Design a protein around this ligand. Structure first.
Ligand SMILES: *Oc1cc([N+](=O)[O-])ccc1*
Length: 184
């Protein structure tokens, strides 16, 4: 079975006059849609966070923090500025065997609340992509979430390939200090 084909970059807008400094810091994964992700409601994906640290050389050190089994997991990698502002490629791709390309395109952001970012990669000659909806908080509006579904569908993704990860406290919010909620 083949994957839904990756859309042409023509269908994927680029945030105009992208501001690398304002994009920095922590984002939560509020939505995640892609040709290799399947929504599964019995044991749903938990929310994770991705921290973008802008380096002197204007690359990002990008650190994803996830809760997996009963430990914190990480994916640390470098996003190197690409051909246009708001585009990046994966640094040290030589160290990812079978990965022949990895492209990042910031679609839209207002920097202080939300962003949508497109990722496309090629691995053992198959084409993969996702769209991420990032929030500065763990919840976004229904409007931002329906916009994300719309955009996802415009790139060829049916609803069963669109996931809204369940908010969590462990690992991803190092300062939430959660406790039992009064009249939750
Ligand atoms: O798309 C995507 C990103 C991560 N991450 O750790 O940053 C993990 C799985 C999927």
């Amino acid at each position: 079975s083949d994957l839904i084909p990756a859309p042409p970059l023509s269908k994927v807008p680029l945030q105009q006059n992208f501001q690398d400094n304002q994009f920095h810091g922590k984002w939560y994964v509020v939505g995640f849609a892609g040709n290799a992700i399947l929504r599964e409601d019995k044991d749903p994906q938990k929310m994770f966070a991705t921290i973008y640290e802008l380096k002197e050389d204007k690359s990002y050190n990008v650190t994803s923090v996830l809760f997996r089994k009963k430990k914190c997991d990480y994916w640390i990698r470098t996003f190197v500025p690409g051909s246009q502002p708001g585009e990046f490629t994966l640094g040290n791709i030589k160290s990812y065997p079978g990965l022949t390309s990895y492209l990042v395109r910031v679609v839209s952001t207002n920097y202080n609340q939300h962003a949508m970012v497109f990722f496309k990669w090629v691995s053992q000659n198959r084409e993969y992509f996702n769209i991420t909806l990032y929030g500065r908080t763990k919840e976004l509006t229904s409007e931002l979430k329906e916009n994300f579904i719309r955009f996802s569908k415009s790139l060829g993704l049916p609803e069963n390939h669109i996931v809204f990860p369940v908010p969590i406290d462990q690992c991803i919010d190092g300062s939430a200090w959660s406790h039992p909620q009064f009249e939750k």
